[PDB]
Amino acid sequence: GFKQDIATIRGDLRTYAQDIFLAFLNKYPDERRYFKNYVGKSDQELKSMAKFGDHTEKVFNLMMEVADRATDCVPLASDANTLVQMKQHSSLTTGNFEKLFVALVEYMRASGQSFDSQSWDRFGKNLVSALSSAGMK
Ligand code: HEM
């Protein structure tokens, strides 16, 4: 289930974080514009670079904190607020997050592992609703 998936992801956080983030950028290439220092780099280039790994791991760490604090895939209002009020997220709309979660769910569906992809789809939908509520356009 969802709790197990959090454990799975945390167990190899840097690998999943990189793989899912790359799946996101490659499926939605226009999104790479928010990441000016990743423009013009292959997947293996980016994997070579500690800063790419560091960024992505920090993102997914927080994502797993928010997921673990959720009840039945419903995130806390407070966690939504953190994500909306972070300086780094000042130019984002809910669609940016929507894209990330579609990529994550598609990754899970493609993985051949028994991820609870339906729960991640719901968690993403709930988080998007909560960001919108916290003031995100
Ligand atoms: C649940 C989803 C997300 C979480 C948990 C999250 C979390 C974070 C965290 C923790 C940082 C700071 C990382 C660091 O210090 O290295 C960060 C930075 C950032 N995030 Fe997000 N993020 C999310 C979604 C997104 C999406 C969808 C976008 C854009 C499509 C985005 C764009 C950025 C950018 C541009 C930065 C700054 C890049 C940098 O200077 O390192 N985030 N995010």
| Protein residue closest via CA to atom 36 of ligand 1 | 88
CA distance 88 to 60: 15
Experimental determination technique: X-ray
88 is in an annotated binding site: yes
Q: What are phi and psi of 74, to 5 degrees?
A: -105, 110
CA distance 45 to 56: 14
CA distance 98 to 112: 23
Q: Is 99 exposed, middle or buried (0-12, 13-18, 19+ CB in 10 A)?
A: middle
CA distance 1 to 40: 37
DSSP states along 40-54 = T--HHHHHH-HHHHH
In angstroms, what CA-CA distances link 53 with 40, 50, 130? 17, 5, 28
Q: Domains, the chain, ranges and CATH? A: 1-137 (1.10.490.10)
CA distance 127 to 80: 7
- Rounded to the nearest angstrom, the distance between the alpha carbon of 114 and the centre of ligand 1 is 27
- Rounded to the nearest angstrom, the distance between the alpha carbon of 10 and the centre of ligand 1 is 18
Contact 103, 22 (CB under 8 A): no
Contact 94, 131 (CB under 8 A): yes
- Give the list of residues 6+ apart from residue 8 with CB closer than 8 angstroms, or none: 16, 113, 115
- Give the list of residues 6+ apart from residue 36 with CB closer than 8 angstroms, or none: none
